[PDB]
């Protein structure tokens, strides 16, 4: 049969890729390290507690000024905070109560959100003689919105539960490009420092590298053994980290095209909800289902600290652009700023 | 620093206006009860919607004795539910609609497997399930006079007998009484195995012509709220 021949040729090509990756694996990241000094003990304290959400918080995103913060909760509310003073700047009521993601524009003029209504809604924060209104609704996804990130004021990339990613023209509201190839629900996306590439993690235990201006998949990474929930780029753009339901974080290299490091412990048996890097990339912070956040040494894969202040599941995580503080959202309806 | 003091005064006033609005939203939020309507298209789930009265989710609002209820139905999502079902961990109850007549593909075993995963999911351990075994009239035709059989799909039905506390309907054949309570005991076997006093199952027999399911949702939800309030008296 012709279907059997294609499966044999695909199986042959997978062996060629695996041998090519094994040929370039002359050493490991642990061997290159293990002579450098360890990080030590990272002890952060809660500096701020943000209160006002009525239900569980699903997402948060820092502004580029490292002071303004937006969070999303399933009470149908979108709150913009001033983290230095804990004052609320805006409170946007949402048409759909089932928001699952939120984003902050790098210009600070817009905020996006979406969820189970399969729509990415854009809100203009700089309306002339008025409050915050809905600038644009982006429709076309046949599954729930899981992540969204602005490229600029007129472009945004979204993930969805219909195994696809899309690039939008906000002014016209049309999908410019569709990114296909995943076989499970896409859960997270992360943009490169230069907005030419992004990575996505899906429920097929794989991550893909996409080219924005050509709409094609360049590299596929298959280290994990369960659903990938979070993904984040390294600061230099040559690597990224993932968090999965197999109670394991992993680090992948783009130029070596394979996994480098695994961050796991025997007594950790819960999935990872969010991951982020510090400013230099030495620390890898991950939020877990056991209500805690663990600080990992990215180069040596030994745990350096614990952030334990939430009474329910940690759902989102974020580090400022200047590296001064981290923010954690949780299902107990509280946001905390750690330092 | 006169401008610095004025802009923080203006920022404090804008925070006060937001907090006043969030007080009104808190009163509405706790006076409203949210329900998830889950079921297949053939199960008669859409018939339950009219009894109470592209898009990713639909909402139905109804009021029983000055109490507001918001029921949500999943419109356009894939059949893989393990990710988006975590959003409904804080609803008052999950309304689960089962076609009791679909026992011969095995749709009844498929509904039992879905109920098992919902009952044993770690994020749904405190959520009660209101179970509606739908289309009893269709089950009546296929058991009394019809040649359709349930022992081939469920071999344990041969040894099963009607429980003594079961109340047959007026003008109901005994043979279809066994058919109804055997399907109910299939779900009660799952719920009582790991209930642990956190969540409870409320099974009901329903039909399209009933129009009394709206009251039974209200009564079960009242019992759910009562047992949530009872957990505060074991303070240690």
């Amino acid at each position, epitope marked *: 049969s012709e279907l059997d021949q294609l499966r044999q040729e695909a199986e042959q090509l997978k062996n060629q890729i695996r041998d090519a990756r094994k040929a370039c694996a002359d050493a490991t990241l642990s061997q290159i390290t293990n002579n450098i000094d360890p990080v030590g003990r990272i002890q952060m304290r809660t500096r701020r507690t943000l209160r006002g959400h009525l239900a569980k918080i699903y997402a948060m995103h820092w502004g580029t000024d490292s002071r303004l913060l937006v969070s999303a909760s399933q009470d149908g509310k979108l709150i913009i905070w001033d983290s230095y003073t804990t004052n609320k700047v805006h409170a946007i009521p949402l048409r759909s109560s089932w928001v699952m993601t939120c984003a902050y524009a790098p210009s600070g003029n817009y905020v996006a959100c979406g969820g189970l209504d399969n729509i990415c809604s854009i809100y203009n924060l700089k309306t002339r003689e008025g409050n915050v209104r809905v600038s644009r609704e982006l429709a076309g996804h046949t599954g729930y919105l899981s992540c969204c990130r602005f490229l600029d004021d007129n472009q945004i990339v979204t993930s969805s539960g219909d195994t696809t990613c899309a690039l939008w023209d906000i002014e016209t509201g049309q999908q410019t490009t569709t990114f296909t190839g995943h076989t499970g629900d896409v859960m997270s996306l992360s943009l490169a420092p230069d907005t030419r590439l992004f990575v996505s993690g899906a429920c097929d235990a794989s991550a893909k590298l996409w080219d924005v201006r050509e709409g094609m998949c360049r590299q596929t990474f298959t280290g994990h053994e*369960s659903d990938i929930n979070a993904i984040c780029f390294f600061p230099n753009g040559n690597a990224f980290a993932t968090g999965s339901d197999d109670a394991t974080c992993r680090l992948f290299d783009l130029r070596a095209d394979q996994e480098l490091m695994t961050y796991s412990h025997d007594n950790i048996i819960c999935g990872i909800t969010s991951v982020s890097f510090s400013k230099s990339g030495r620390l890898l912070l991950a939020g877990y289902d056991d209500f805690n956040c663990n600080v990992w040494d990215a180069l040596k894969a030994d745990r350096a600290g614990v952030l334990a202040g939430h009474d329910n599941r940690v759902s989102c995580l974020g580090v400022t652009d200047d590296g001064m503080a981290v923010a954690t959202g949780s299902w107990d309806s509280f946001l905390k700023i750690w330092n | 620093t006169e401008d610095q003091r004025n802009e923080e005064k203006a920022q404090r006033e804008a925070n006060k206006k937001i907090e006043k609005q969030l007080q009104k939203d808190k009163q509405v939020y706790r006076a409203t009860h949210r329900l998830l309507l889950l079921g297949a298209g053939e199960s008669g789930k859409n018939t339950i919607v009219k009894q109470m009265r592209t898009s990713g989710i639909f909402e139905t609002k109804f009021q029983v004795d000055k109490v507001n209820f918001h029921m949500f139905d999943v419109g356009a999502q894939r059949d893989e539910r393990r990710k988006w079902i975590q959003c409904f961990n804080d609803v008052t109850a999950i309304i689960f609609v089962v076609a009791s007549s679909s026992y011969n593909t095995n749709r009844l075993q498929a509904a039992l497997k879905l109920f098992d995963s919902i009952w044993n999911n770690k994020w749904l351990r405190d959520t009660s399930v209101i179970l509606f075994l739908n289309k009893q009239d269709l089950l009546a035709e296929k058991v009394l006079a019809g040649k359709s059989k349930i022992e081939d799909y469920f071999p344990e039905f041969a040894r099963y007998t009607t429980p003594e506390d079961a109340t047959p309907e007026p003008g109901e054949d005994p043979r279809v009484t066994r058919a109804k309570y055997f399907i109910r005991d299939e779900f009660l076997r799952i719920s009582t195995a790991s209930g642990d006093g956190r969540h409870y199952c409320y099974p009901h027999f329903t039909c399209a012509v009933d129009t009394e399911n709206i009251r039974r949702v209200f009564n079960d939800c009242r019992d759910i709220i009562q047992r949530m309030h009872l957990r505060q008296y074991e303070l240690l």
Partner: nanobody, 128 residues
Framework: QVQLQESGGGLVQPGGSLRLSCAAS????????MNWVRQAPGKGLEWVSD????????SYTGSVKGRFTISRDNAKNTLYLQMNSLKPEDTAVYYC?????????????????????RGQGTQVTVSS
């Protein structure tokens, strides 16, 4: 790379026997509950049997109770399904399915179309 490969199917007379195997790789086999599912030539995907992480917790669908036996081998990472007294109604493509997450009591989407943690299946045909 999670991979499941099934083998053992074939043409068998009614009342005959078959043994199916499922070789697993790419994950820790002892942390997951395993399933067998099948697809008849006309109908959709149907759950058949499942076994827990250490065995000792076995359930079957009603039409195969007393005729099928599911077995586990954590040392060799193999799943088995012994079939006895085969009927023409057992003609299907049998798949080896894994539950999505480890250390979990529940398994959600093993019978869904386009499920990632399922194998390609083997054809079982019962005819006289």
């Amino acid at each position: 790379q999670v991979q499941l490969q099934e083998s053992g199917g074939g043409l068998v007379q009614p009342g005959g026997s078959l043994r199916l195997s499922c070789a697993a790789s790419g994950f820790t086999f002892s942390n997951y509950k395993m399933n067998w599912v099948r697809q008849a030539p006309g109908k959709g995907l149907e759950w058949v049997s499942d076994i827990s992480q250490s065995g000792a917790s076995i359930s079957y669908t009603g039409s195969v109770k007393g005729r099928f036996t599911i077995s586990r081998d954590n040392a060799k990472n193999t799943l088995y399904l012994q079939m006895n007294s085969l009927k023409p109604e057992d003609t299907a493509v049998y798949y080896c399915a894994r539950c999505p997450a480890p250390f979990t009591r529940d398994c959600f989407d093993v019978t869904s179309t386009t499920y990632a943690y399922r194998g390609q299946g083997t054809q079982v045909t019962v005819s006289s």
